[PDB]
Design a protein around this ligand. Structure first.
Ligand SMILES: *[C@H]1O[C@H](CO)[C@H](O)[C@H](O[C@H]2O[C@H](CO)[C@H](O)[C@H](O)[C@H]2NC(C)=O)[C@H]1NC(C)=O
Ligand SMILES: *[C@H]1O[C@H](CO)[C@H](O)[C@H](O[C@H]2O[C@H](CO)[C@H](O)[C@H](O)[C@H]2NC(C)=O)[C@H]1NC(C)=O
Ligand SMILES: *[C@H]1O[C@H](CO)[C@H](O)[C@H](O)[C@H]1NC(C)=O
Ligand SMILES: *[C@H]1O[C@H](CO)[C@H](O)[C@H](O)[C@H]1NC(C)=O
Ligand SMILES: OC[C@H]1O[C@H](O)[C@@H](O)[C@@H](O)[C@@H]1O
Ligand SMILES: OC[C@H]1O[C@H](O)[C@@H](O)[C@@H](O)[C@@H]1O
Lengths: 63, 63
């Protein structure tokens, strides 16, 4: 094992470190939109439950 | 000490002076090829370092 093999190893590490890491921001954006969609789908279920009890929809989240 | 001993001494000096000196040219040839080999091994390390920075090899020594 010699300095030229070790420079090749360092060079290839620099390549793999650059390319094998995903765009984390783009991944989290799509997960975050799923949270919003899921929370609105829940708010919709609870608007219908409030409608069962009160014959009207809520304007306030605490209800 | 006499002229015949001194002629023997001169004769043996002439022999030792002829045989105890190495072929200097042949020795330097093998050392010189080692310099070339070592310099190309260095140029190879630096081609890999240029490849790390530029994603290409150099055509010019100044790089
Ligand atoms: C939902 O609650 C809101 C405050 O959290 C706000 O009060 C909205 O307006 C209501 O005001 C009172 C109830 O607080 C009224 O009797 C009606 O429910 C309603 N008034 C008007 C102007 O409609 C309430 N819902 C909405 C958006 O009407
Ligand atoms: C390495 O440098 C050479 C001069 O020192 C020479 O320029 C070679 O050719 C390049 O020419 C320019 C860069 O100077 C180009 O944009 C390319 O890098 C290259 N051109 C061609 C024809 O390939 C350059 N490397 C080599 C041998 O291509
Ligand atoms: C929801 O009910 C709780 C008690 O169960 C509190 O009264 C709260 O204030 C209610 N939210 C609103 C403001 O409608
Ligand atoms: C190497 O870099 C030096 C500066 O650090 C000079 O710019 C020199 O010209 C370079 N060699 C070439 C020609 O690539
Ligand atoms: O102030 C009371 C008033 O509050 C709100 C609405 O629910 C009305 O129906 C109700 O009469
Ligand atoms: O003239 C610029 C030209 O020079 C050389 C190469 O590095 C090319 O990629 C570059 O576009």
């Amino acid at each position: 094992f010699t300095l030229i093999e070790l420079l090749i190893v360092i060079a290839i590490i620099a390549i793999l470190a650059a390319v094998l890491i995903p765009n984390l921001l783009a991944a989290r954006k799509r997960a975050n939109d799923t949270v919003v969609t899921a929370y609105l789908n829940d708010a919709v279920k609870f608007q219908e439950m409030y409608q069962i009890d009160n014959n009207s929809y809520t304007s306030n989240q605490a209800a």
